[PDB]
Design a protein around this nucleic acid. Structure first.
Length: 51
RNA sequence: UUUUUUUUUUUUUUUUUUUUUUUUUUCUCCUCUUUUUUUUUUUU
C-alpha cells in the first residue's frame, strides 16, 4: 500500500543498517517509480558529519 | 506494471619571373577683262 510500502522500506532498511551490510543496491525495474521510491522516504541520514 | 544501446563540424602551406607613346591608304583638279605697273614733295 501507499503507506504500507513505506513500512517495507523502513523494515528492510532497519534490520540491515545495524549490521555491516549497509551499502545496498536496489534493482528497481522502472525509470519512473525509481525516483518515487527515494522521494517518499525523506529521512535516512546515513552519513557521518565528517564524510 | 514499459528496461538497454546506436562516434563527429577536410588534412596542408616557409611560390621564381629580367618591359614602355603609337600601330595600317583614297586620284587628277580653267582664279573673267582701263593699263603701262604708280612713285618727288610737305605736314605723324
Amino acid at each position: 500500500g501507499p503507506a504500507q510500502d513505506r513500512g517495507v522500506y523502513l523494515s528492510l532498511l532497519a534490520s540491515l543498517r545495524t549490521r555491516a551490510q549497509l551499502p545496498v543496491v536496489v534493482f528497481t525495474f522502472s525509470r519512473g517509480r525509481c525516483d518515487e521510491q527515494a522521494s517518499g522516504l525523506t529521512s535516512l541520514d546515513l552519513t557521518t558529519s565528517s564524510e
